[PDB]
Design a protein around this motif. Structure first.
Motif, PDB file in Angstrom:
ATOM      1  N   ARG A 142       0.813  -1.222   0.000  1.00 21.67           N
ATOM      2  CA  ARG A 142       0.000   0.000   0.000  1.00 21.67           C
ATOM      3  C   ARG A 142       0.840   1.261   0.000  1.00 21.67           C
ATOM      4  O   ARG A 142       0.294   2.361   0.099  1.00 21.67           O
ATOM      5  CB  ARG A 142      -0.949   0.026   1.197  1.00 21.67           C
ATOM      6  N   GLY A 143       2.155   1.108  -0.110  1.00 19.11           N
ATOM      7  CA  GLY A 143       3.067   2.235  -0.114  1.00 19.11           C
ATOM      8  C   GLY A 143       3.323   2.890   1.232  1.00 19.11           C
ATOM      9  O   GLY A 143       3.846   4.000   1.274  1.00 19.11           O
ATOM     10  N   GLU A 144       2.986   2.207   2.334  1.00 20.79           N
ATOM     11  CA  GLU A 144       3.196   2.713   3.692  1.00 20.79           C
ATOM     12  C   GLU A 144       4.585   2.273   4.132  1.00 20.79           C
ATOM     13  O   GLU A 144       5.081   1.193   3.819  1.00 20.79           O
ATOM     14  CB  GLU A 144       2.130   2.138   4.626  1.00 20.79           C
ATOM     15  N   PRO A 145       5.225   3.100   5.001  1.00 22.77           N
ATOM     16  CA  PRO A 145       6.505   2.715   5.599  1.00 22.77           C
ATOM     17  C   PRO A 145       6.301   1.651   6.685  1.00 22.77           C
ATOM     18  O   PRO A 145       5.209   1.506   7.246  1.00 22.77           O
ATOM     19  CB  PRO A 145       7.036   4.028   6.183  1.00 22.77           C
ATOM     20  N   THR A 146       7.351   0.894   6.962  1.00 20.69           N
ATOM     21  CA  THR A 146       7.312  -0.089   8.043  1.00 20.69           C
ATOM     22  C   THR A 146       7.420   0.663   9.382  1.00 20.69           C
ATOM     23  O   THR A 146       8.060   1.707   9.452  1.00 20.69           O
ATOM     24  CB  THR A 146       8.472  -1.085   7.882  1.00 20.69           C
ATOM     25  N   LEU A 147       6.786   0.152  10.431  1.00 20.67           N
ATOM     26  CA  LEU A 147       6.812   0.847  11.723  1.00 20.67           C
ATOM     27  C   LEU A 147       8.176   0.682  12.428  1.00 20.67           C
ATOM     28  O   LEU A 147       8.532   1.474  13.311  1.00 20.67           O
ATOM     29  CB  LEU A 147       5.664   0.359  12.626  1.00 20.67           C
ATOM     30  N   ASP A 148       8.938  -0.342  12.022  1.00 21.93           N
ATOM     31  CA  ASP A 148      10.298  -0.549  12.536  1.00 21.93           C
ATOM     32  C   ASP A 148      11.369   0.323  11.849  1.00 21.93           C
ATOM     33  O   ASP A 148      12.485   0.456  12.365  1.00 21.93           O
ATOM     34  CB  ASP A 148      10.680  -2.039  12.465  1.00 21.93           C
ATOM     35  N   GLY A 149      11.051   0.883  10.680  1.00 25.89           N
ATOM     36  CA  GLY A 149      11.966   1.773   9.975  1.00 25.89           C
ATOM     37  C   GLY A 149      13.006   1.080   9.097  1.00 25.89           C
ATOM     38  O   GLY A 149      13.788   1.743   8.436  1.00 25.89           O
ATOM     39  N   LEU A 150      13.022  -0.246   9.100  1.00 29.10           N
ATOM     40  CA  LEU A 150      13.895  -1.034   8.228  1.00 29.10           C
ATOM     41  C   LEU A 150      13.180  -1.385   6.924  1.00 29.10           C
ATOM     42  O   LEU A 150      11.965  -1.351   6.854  1.00 29.10           O
ATOM     43  CB  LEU A 150      14.317  -2.315   8.949  1.00 29.10           C
ATOM     44  N   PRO A 151      13.928  -1.714   5.879  1.00 28.06           N
ATOM     45  CA  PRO A 151      13.306  -2.065   4.596  1.00 28.06           C
ATOM     46  C   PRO A 151      12.311  -3.233   4.702  1.00 28.06           C
ATOM     47  O   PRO A 151      12.561  -4.237   5.371  1.00 28.06           O
ATOM     48  CB  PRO A 151      14.502  -2.444   3.718  1.00 28.06           C
ATOM     49  N   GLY A 152      11.172  -3.078   4.040  1.00 30.28           N
ATOM     50  CA  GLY A 152      10.227  -4.159   3.905  1.00 30.28           C
ATOM     51  C   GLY A 152      10.633  -5.060   2.755  1.00 30.28           C
ATOM     52  O   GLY A 152      11.626  -4.804   2.072  1.00 30.28           O
ATOM     53  N   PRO A 153       9.883  -6.134   2.547  1.00 32.75           N
ATOM     54  CA  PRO A 153      10.111  -6.986   1.367  1.00 32.75           C
ATOM     55  C   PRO A 153      10.082  -6.170   0.067  1.00 32.75           C
ATOM     56  O   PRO A 153       9.327  -5.190  -0.045  1.00 32.75           O
ATOM     57  CB  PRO A 153       8.983  -8.017   1.447  1.00 32.75           C
TER      58      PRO A 153
END
Ligand SMILES: CC[C@]1(O)Cc2cc3c(c(O)c2[C@@H](O[C@H]2C[C@H](N(C)C)[C@H](O[C@@H]4C[C@H](O)[C@@H](O[C@H]5CCC(=O)[C@@H](C)O5)[C@H](C)O4)[C@H](C)O2)C1)C(=O)c1c(O)cccc1C3=O
Length: 297
Positions: A142-153
């Motif tokens: 959905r183009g949202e950032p991860t809440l952990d701040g690290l790269p998503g898949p």
């Protein structure tokens, strides 16, 4: 040799490599992957360094108890206890454990709740218990950032999922399909050989009684809560985290982050590697794991 080991209300298929007198190394595969997700040739390369290598089928894979998940639900607590049951089944008190991908999540649970059964810990292609992985797949789409701040898949992971949704009729098509998935996930950073991966998949299918359908029960799993990450500060067995340089599911610096949760963790990176096990990386992986297990003994 092979054996069926008991673990509560399931039975787990397991086999080994190398001398049963050498120190135990337990291989813990990723999600929906049987023992044969660890190529025979990789297991041998490891065993031939001085290790008794043991691998097994997770419940709902290979020749282990397979069941309707909805009627009999389980989580990572069960997956981790099952790994320890394999150690019980082979008479092993403490083992060097190696967790790959979803298996690295499992081995974090082993480290927290069955720490007494560990000589050392190795994790690769994985990430910390504080990474909300499933939610992160949803967010990247959905183009949202991860809440952990690290790269998503990344895109190759998504490409791999789309292939898995495409239909394959017959054994030849299934194998070709599976190999195309691995080729995507492995990337081009290291040499990928389609013929070798096809043989590994043919063996995986034979091991499953010739059944063409991939295991799917592990898609119904719920991850441990992110609170558990904090408990890893109490782990004391030597820990090695391996980052595949071009991992499309758990990109850098997930590895460095995972190492940062465990006081005994050291980080290594395999240049060019993706989220797969081509024989091009069997030498480098075996080398660093062997060097680690030696220092813990
Ligand atoms: C397909 C390749 C793969 O992703 C490799 C991998 C890699 C990591 C993890 C995996 O579980 C897995 C393995 O993941 C499995 C199981 C995993 N989990 C349930 C946890 C996940 O399956 C999912 C998550 C989705 O959010 C979920 O999507 C929707 C479908 C409709 C629905 O049911 C709603 C509730 O959920 C489906 C049902 O399950 C992925 C797609 O496949 C396989 C991880 O769990 C993981 C982690 O927890 C922390 C850091 C890193 C990782 C990983 O790198």
């Amino acid at each position: 040799s092979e054996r069926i080991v008991p673990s509560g209300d399931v039975e787990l298929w397991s086999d080994d490599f190398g001398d049963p007198a050498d120190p135990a190394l337990l291989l813990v595969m990723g999600g929906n992957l049987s023992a044969l997700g660890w190529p025979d040739e990789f297991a041998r390369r490891l065993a031939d360094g001085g290790l008794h290598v043991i691998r097994y089928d997770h419940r709902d894979t290979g020749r282990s108890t397979t069941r309707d998940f909805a009627a009999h639900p389980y989580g990572f607590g069960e997956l981790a206890a099952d790994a320890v049951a394999v150690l019980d089944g082979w008479g092993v008190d403490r083992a060097h454990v190696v967790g790959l991908s979803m298996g690295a999540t499992i081995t974090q649970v082993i480290a927290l709740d069955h720490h007494d059964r560990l000589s050392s810990l190795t994790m690769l292609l994985g990430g910390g218990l504080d990474i909300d992985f499933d939610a992160n797949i949803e967010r990247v789409m959905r183009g949202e950032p991860t809440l952990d701040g690290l790269p998503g898949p990344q895109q190759p992971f998504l490409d791999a999922l789309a292939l898995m949704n495409q239909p394959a009729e017959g054994r030849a098509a299934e194998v070709a399909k599976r190999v195309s998935k691995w080729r995507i996930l492995s990337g081009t950073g290291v040499p990928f050989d389609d013929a070798e991966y096809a043989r590994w998949e043919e063996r995986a299918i034979d091991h499953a009684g010739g059944v063409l359908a991939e295991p799917y029960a592990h898609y119904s799993l719920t991850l441990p809560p992110p609170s558990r990450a904090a408990e890893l500060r109490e782990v004391t067995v030597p820990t090695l985290v391996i980052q595949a340089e071009h991992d499309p599911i758990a990109p850098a610096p997930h590895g460095k982050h995972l190492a940062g949760l465990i006081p005994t963790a050291r980080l290594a990176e395999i240049p060019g590697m993706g989220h797969a096990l081509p024989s091009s990386v069997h030498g480098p992986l075996a080398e660093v794991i062997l060097a680690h297990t030696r220092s813990a003994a």
